[PDB]
Design a protein around this ligand. Structure first.
Ligand code: FES
Length: 127
């Protein structure tokens, strides 16, 4: 079983972005704090290059799950870097927020949100 990955949530503490390998690429499972959740909720969406509310990019507010591949040219976004406390792609300087939305730099789109579901309070199944 490699098409779907099952991740134990209790292993990822608040504030941590945990990376896994899925379908040959990085997969990020990040436990967000109340502060991060509220900050993403405060974003004025009409000004975004790729407009989406934070709540249509996550199922549970305290968890953001993203494909760790920069939408510009494919490099790997670095967690807790950049001007928006989200991610930073060093290849050409794209800055993403904690929702994975593109906020500064050349990338054209928000980081991809894969298909996933929570099977219980402790597990999330991606794919
Ligand atoms: S590949 Fe990420 S900014 Fe260019």
């Amino acid at each position: 079983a490699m098409s779907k990955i099952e991740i134990k949530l209790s292993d990822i503490p608040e504030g941590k972005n945990m990376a896994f390998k899925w379908r040959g690429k990085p997969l990020f499972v990040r436990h967000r704090t109340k502060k991060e959740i509220d900050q993403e909720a405060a974003v004025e969406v009409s000004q975004l290059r790729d407009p989406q509310h934070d709540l249509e990019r996550v199922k549970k507010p305290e968890w953001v799950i993203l494909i760790g591949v920069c939408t510009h040219l494919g490099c790997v976004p670095i967690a807790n870097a950049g001007d928006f406390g989200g991610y930073y792609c060093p290849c050409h300087g794209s800055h993403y927020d904690a929702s994975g939305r593109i906020r500064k730099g050349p990338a054209p789109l928000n980081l991809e949100v894969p298909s996933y579901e929570f099977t219980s309070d402790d597990m999330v199944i991606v794919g």
